[PDB]
Amino acid sequence: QDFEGVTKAMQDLVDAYNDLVTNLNAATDYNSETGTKGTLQGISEVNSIRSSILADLFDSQVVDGTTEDANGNKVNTKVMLSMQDFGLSLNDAGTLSFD
């Protein structure tokens, strides 16, 4: 099948994700040196979109699993899960790292 070509792109995309995360952070964040709300910081257009679309980004699925946690069917189960769990690690820094 040779999935790999895009597979590489996806992680490169994950990098192209993190740059935008940084751009948001670099651009959108505060200006405390003057105790200042950064130019784009605090803008309603900014805060609403940033949080919402990230929330849009996280949307998840239900799935089966071998189990010692969660809803449970037996020591196997059904679960509510999303991309990061199997796919990719999400940072407190917002960015994404690969496993």
Q: Is 33 in the site for another protein (CB under 8 A)?
A: no
List 11, 33, 47, 96, residue binding another protein (CB under 8 A): 47
Please tell me whether residue 77 binds another protein under the rule CB under 8 A: yes
Least separation in angstroms between CB 34 and another protein = 10
Q: Is 98 in the site for another protein (CB under 8 A)?
A: no
> What's the CA gap between 67 and 79, in Å, rounded?
9
Residue 95 backbone dihedrals phi, psi, to 5 degrees: -65, 180
Q: Between vectors from CA 77 to CA 74 and to CA 80, what angle results, nearest 5°? A: 155
Q: How many helices (H) and strands (E) does the chain have?
A: 3, 4
Cross-strand pairs, 80? 62
Binding site for another protein (CB under 8 A): 1-3, 5-6, 9-10, 13, 16-17, 19-20, 23-24, 27-28, 30, 35-37, 40-45, 47-49, 51-54, 56-61, 65-72, 77, 79-82, 84-85, 90, 92
